[PDB]
Design a protein around this ligand. Structure first.
Ligand SMILES: [Zn+2]
Ligand SMILES: [Zn+2]
Ligand SMILES: [Zn+2]
Ligand SMILES: [Zn+2]
Ligand SMILES: [Zn+2]
Ligand SMILES: [Zn+2]
Ligand SMILES: [Zn+2]
Ligand SMILES: [Zn+2]
Ligand SMILES: [Zn+2]
Lengths: 109, 108
């Protein structure tokens, strides 16, 4: 399923961008409040959903912060990605079983 | 890593459910067009982003189709999941010109 895989990987990359930004925001609130609010204001003007454009914009407005975001995103990716295939497949099987059981019990009782 | 991994796995489970519905919609458009139309109406009323509510609502409205979604999303999951870490990290390393330069300064 090449198309599905490619679209999912793009989605996953954007989502890990969002997670990296979330972590940095938390850290900034404790160590650099001025930057925490700057990032808050930037995120209101640029949708993180469009992550490539988000990062390219910040490259022009705050290069030091985007480099931190890119470093944190790669560390997150490296740490968490290989957990996902087993977690997601096991979650989906369990969720499929629960819904099939719920369905079977309606039809039968 | 733990909180992020969990939140990501949940997002991925929902995204693969969405992909399953898209695949099925395409399939219905060929072999059962009236039900592709119905599925469009269903999807405007029930956002796919609210994944559990989506499946619970369809369990009440079209049981064969919900069973089909369960089957397709699992097949997609088995077919794609193990490719993702390598694809995403490779994308992330390549797009990031600082990674290449970090390797260079390490080599010198
Ligand atoms: Zn701006
Ligand atoms: Zn661009
Ligand atoms: Zn792997
Ligand atoms: Zn694995
Ligand atoms: Zn199953
Ligand atoms: Zn409905
Ligand atoms: Zn449910
Ligand atoms: Zn039917
Ligand atoms: Zn690197």
């Amino acid at each position: 399923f090449k198309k599905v895989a490619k679209e999912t990987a793009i989605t996953l990359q954007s989502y890990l961008t969002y997670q990296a930004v979330r972590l940095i925001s938390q850290q900034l609130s404790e160590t650099n409040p001025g930057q925490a609010i700057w990032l808050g204001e930037f995120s209101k003007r640029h949708p993180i959903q469009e992550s490539d454009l988000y990062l390219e914009a910040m490259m022009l407005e705050n290069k030091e912060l985007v480099l931190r975001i890119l470093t944190v995103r790669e560390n997150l990716a490296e740490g968490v990605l290989e957990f996902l295939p087993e977690m997601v497949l096991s979650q989906i099987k369990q969720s499929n079983g629960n819904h099939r059981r719920s369905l079977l019990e309606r039809l039968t009782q």
